[PDB]
């Protein structure tokens, strides 16, 4: 699996609901080895998300500096584990939002490889 393809599996849902995160965290394999605690899905075209790597260069939350913030806010869905969630029985709360996405980009072609934050 390439880094770019892993970002698409974990974070892109361009074609698309309070069960959404429970359905999607399982279908994208994010409950397989552990309950991935927080994960965001983006409901914008893949072209529009890839274009963020040409938008505003900002620091990543860990201090790396190859992150990029979208000039427009985007339709996103935050998936966050519930208080009862415990692996192997993962459970998620779904929250829809409209926020600027921040991604780390790598490669040539230069594309998103990590979803960092929304602001």
């Amino acid at each position: 699996e390439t880094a770019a393809a892993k970002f698409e599996r974990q974070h892109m849902d361009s074609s698309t609901s309070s069960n959404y995160c429970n359905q999607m965290m399982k279908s994208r394999n994010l409950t397989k080895d552990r309950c991935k605690p927080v994960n965001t899905f983006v409901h914008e075209s893949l072209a529009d998300v890839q274009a963020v790597c040409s938008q505003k260069n900002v620091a990543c939350k860990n201090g790396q500096t190859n992150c990029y913030q979208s000039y427009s806010t985007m339709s996103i869905t935050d998936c966050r584990e519930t208080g009862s969630s415990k692996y192997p029985n993962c459970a998620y709360k779904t929250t829809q939002a409209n926020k600027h996405i921040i991604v780390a980009c790598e490669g040539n072609p230069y594309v998103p490889v990590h979803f960092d934050a929304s602001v």
């Epitope: 505003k56 620091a59 190859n66 040539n108």
Partner: nanobody, 123 residues
Amino acid sequence: GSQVQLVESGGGLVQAGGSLRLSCAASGYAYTYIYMGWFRQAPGKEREGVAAMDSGGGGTLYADSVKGRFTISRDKGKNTVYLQMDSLKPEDTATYYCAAGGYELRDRTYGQWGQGTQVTVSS
């Protein structure tokens, strides 16, 4: 100026022991690139990071082979990065590339690249 362009100048042919400066100025990007740097690809070798510096003039990193001979600076213009190269050695012969928007000397993290400027150090 719809396209980002990393304009490279300086470099070229020089005798061993001599000096050159490489200059890079980005145009077409409205904000500040946090990291800029210089990479090179020498004959027979993979591309490597040579020097990089953050927009505050800090986070400065050099390839071990050039520490104490090359000096990177960003104090000469917004999104500009310069490399003073002293005491040049034949093994510094390479295509040098300006890069912007990445992290430290990690090539895969940079998304904007100059076209490449030849530096040739003769004996």
